[PDB]
Design a protein around this nucleic acid. Structure first.
Lengths: 109, 95, 98, 79, 62, 98, 79, 109, 95
DNA sequence: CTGGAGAATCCCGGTGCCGAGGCCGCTCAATTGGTCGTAGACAGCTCTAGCACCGCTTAAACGCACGTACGCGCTGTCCCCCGCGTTTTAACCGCCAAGGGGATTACTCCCTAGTCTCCAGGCACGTGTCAGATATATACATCCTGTGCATGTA
DNA sequence: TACATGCACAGGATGTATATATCTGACACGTGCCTGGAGACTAGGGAGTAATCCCCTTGGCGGTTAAAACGCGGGGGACAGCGCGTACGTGCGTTTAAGCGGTGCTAGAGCTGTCTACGACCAATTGAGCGGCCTCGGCACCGGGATTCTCCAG
């Protein structure tokens, strides 16, 4: 290394690790060879979907008068958003609980 | 004792951009790490089948883009494809 | 006369508490012994990590709770508020689990 | 005192209350113990199958989440 | 089977608070184990002799 | 007077003829126009191999026929024999589609 | 013009008869047509996605069986 | 010279193609390397499962009073067998039709 | 034009062991060729996951055996394991 | 429709703690800068099979007339399940010990991949023929109202 | 007192099923060949092993208290008859468009041959990311008050 290094994530403009994503694509046996544009695309998607679920969980935390995200706020985030509930349609979150819901015909009047 | 890798520092870096005043518990962090591992395998596994059907041996941005369009619901897919296209464009022009 | 809540008043109060909160609802030692008993048929002298029986409990309670929601819908469809075994048997067959 | 009887009537009522159920017939308890035992047998069998393949004598939380993931019931929180 | 040197220390520590100078494990284990944390080697030799009698019993009892 | 089969007698005779046969029950050209009209929203000037619309018809008929079995069970669980939109909506919610 | 109307009332009745249905309320036809249209949209979107990835202008029967397998509805007989 | 060749399936006593199954395991990207006992075990299992479904379909052909197997006979074979109906529990067979069944309360009595 | 492989001759060879008198239609043959390819990809895909979970890099008869014990229903699994064990044992005597 | 007592759920101040997150040292995996072999982009060709249009014949769709069979509201009568006092029982709170067995490490060798050559197993193709698909008649099996026996009042 | 009306046939009508004489296109087989697999060989590294290490799972100590289990009254919901109007099954003229079988055309699938941009792989060399470590602050039980839904005699 004659010049100064800069992480591939820094060229791409990402927080997620492009190098690790490339080593995982290589060593996962997904294909014979991995093109240099695939890790940066995949890292940007994982970062985006991570930002979505955390944004909604930080809203759910603030609205529950708390400052630390806990499994409850990830469940409340995922089950209220129409697309994230569809993506995570057959996943369970440990310590998540259930989304508050009562059928109207059970109510006391 | 021996090193175990996880996404936890990158999950924390993203959290501190979108809600800078909040934090995340150790049980929430292992859910977030599990989600990233699952979505990585779901995208890469479909990209693997797409390359194979077309007799290609290389995964490229076209295979990842198509796997994202297949795996994600409609409104997430438009954004995820836009963020991926922006990252490939910034990377290639900054390289 | 002493005070009484009416029938079903405390049932709605219980529904609200158990949906507000994230606790596990089965008693831990009783569940842990059932896990070990079922496992004894597949291999004898098998040990368990303390987190493995918790993962089995989290998955099991999430399964039964999700089954009761579909069971409840199968009762409301039949004009009744009471759940009955015929509702569990319908809910399972319609989801393809029986 | 069969070990399945440790899934008490109160515990089944709490699970049904989280599921939104207002009123429960007295035959639900045996039907639900039958369902739970069938669920646990299917998950534990596969977790033991991963355990034997590893040549290990202890079940590990990974064997459980792999068994659940193979059965299409992915659990998040245990890695 | 057999019993440890700590088990005989816990038993003798419990009898001291119970009837020598007037039980539940929950709160007593703090006082008992923090005493074991500075228990003297001569007392440890006595409790090791008790553990040896328990091990001699265990060799017959299985 | 002319002959009459009693209401429901021909319905059972039809169930038996259509469970005996393997033939496709949707008319082919009407279904082919529906497939092209749905695809026109995703890509313009798209062509279809003749084998592809047959694959979509085989899948679509197999899906609807199985949904009608689940709908029939949802109707028969209530004390009824007539299927109704509520029975489809129950079957598709317990089956996890909605 | 409207093409979903080509799924005729007799056609939906034949599908209901193969499903073992004895008696059909008059509101079932529009409910069905909606359910079929939603099913076809979900399969044909994926099939067109495989077609675009292949840089092709025809849909091919393999794109249909791949779209169906990718949704957990595997169709045998078309290779 | 070189000894006369014999197919790996003949050494195994099989009729399914052990050499093809080895190439498919290598070229499918399932793992870095494939052991010589894997193709033999897999070829035997595909031939077993083939023998089961064909036996039941040939019985269904004889019962339907026909000499050649058709998609109907494969559907009748699979859905009557309580374990092949689990193995193929979310497969649709083209031209298979439906297994005859009527709910008991629909009957005219 | 150029050669496409399929399982059709091996399906026909097995058919002439189990029912010497019967034949099979070409539509039934494309179903059988679909069934063989589906079960191959299911077994081999779980053998791949078993090897990766255990940090190995060789697929072997242990991996296939465990994949067959997970994928198949209860009585089919015991029979399939017996046929595979018999075949590898026979092959080992002449390999 | 409700005033007022009862009992549960709540909002707030005070209180202790142990887990989030910030820091430091060090190994290990991601940069950087080569060479080089080939996967796939590209252009041009061949010719399959998809698209468009037409005429004719005929089953299927449709629109209506008709009349029970079904769905649904409402009543009444239990028989369960819920709310809650009273008694009973076993889960669970901490601490540690013993040792069973996952984890790691150093050795080493047998097994898998590469790399030749060089035929015979498996495909594309051509070819008769017989079993499945038609046919016309005939044969039981099933369906749906009146018809008399045999029921019972007057 | 002058016929009620179950109800097991008798049978007219209508469909599903079987025996059967001919026809034909899809099947099972025969063959030329060509390419993918087997026979014979070498090299290196994954995998099996034996030897500590150390760590976390299994077992154990009671008391008390909180959860389960029990007994009971009574209310309000499950469920079985009943009446009644209309919606959906059956069946007939009538009509409409699907299925067929030609014709004719060209977009574009599927392919070969080529040239190069691109990814693998190796040898350096760092700095990003992990484990161990400490500490102080968000959250979790408390303890009042208090307030806000619940039930019932007005």
């Amino acid at each position: 290394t004659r010049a100064k290094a800069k992480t591939r994530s820094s060229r791409a403009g990402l927080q997620f690790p492009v190098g690790r994503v490339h080593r995982l694509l290589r060593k996962g046996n997904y294909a014979e060879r991995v093109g240099a544009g695939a890790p940066v695309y995949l890292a940007a998607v994982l970062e985006y979907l991570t930002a979505e679920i955390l944004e909604l969980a930080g809203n759910a935390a603030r609205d529950n008068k708390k400052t630390r995200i806990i499994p409850r706020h990830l469940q409340l985030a995922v089950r209220n958003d129409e697309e994230l509930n569809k993506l995570l349609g057959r996943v369970t979150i440990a310590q998540g609980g259930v989304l508050p819901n009562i059928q109207s015909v059970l109510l006391p009047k | 004792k021996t090193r175990k890798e996880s996404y936890a520092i990158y999950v924390y870096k993203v959290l501190k951009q979108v809600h800078p005043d909040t934090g995340i518990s150790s049980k929430a962090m292992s859910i977030m790490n599990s989600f990233v591992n699952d979505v990585f395998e779901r995208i890469a596994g479909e990209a693997s089948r797409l390359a194979h059907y077309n007799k290609r041996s290389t995964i490229t941005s076209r295979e990842i883009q198509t796997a994202v369009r297949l795996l994600l619901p409609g409104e997430l897919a438009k954004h995820a494809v836009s963020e991926g296209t922006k990252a490939v464009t910034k990377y290639t022009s900054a390289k | 006369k002493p005070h009484r809540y009416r029938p079903g008043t405390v049932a709605l109060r219980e529904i609200r508490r158990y949906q507000k909160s994230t606790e596990l609802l089965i008693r831990k030692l009783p569940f842990q012994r059932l896990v070990r008993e079922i496992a004894q048929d597949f291999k004898t002298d098998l040990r368990f990590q303390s987190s493995a029986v918790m993962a089995l409990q989290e998955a099991s309670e999430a399964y039964l709770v999700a089954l009761f929601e579909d069971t409840n819908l199968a009762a409301i469809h039949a004009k009744r508020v009471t759940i009955m075994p015929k509702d569990i048997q319908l809910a399972r067959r319609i989801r393809g689990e029986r | 005192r069969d070990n399945i009887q440790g899934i008490t009537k109160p515990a089944i009522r709490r699970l049904a209350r989280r599921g939104g159920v207002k009123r429960i017939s007295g035959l639900i308890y045996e039907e639900t113990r039958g369902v739970l035992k069938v669920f646990l047998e299917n998950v534990i069998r596969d977790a033991v199958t991963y355990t034997e393949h590893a040549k290990r004598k202890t079940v590990t939380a990974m064997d459980v989440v792999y068994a659940l993931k193979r059965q299409g019931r992915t659990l998040y929180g245990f890695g | 089977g057999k019993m440890s040197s700590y088990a005989f220390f816990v038993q003798t520590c419990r009898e001291e608070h119970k009837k020598k100078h007037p039980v539940n494990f929950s709160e007593f284990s703090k006082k008992c184990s923090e005493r074991w944390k500075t228990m003297s080697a001569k007392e440890k030799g006595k409790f090791e002799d008790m553990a040896k009698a328990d091990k001699a019993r265990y060799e017959r009892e299985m």
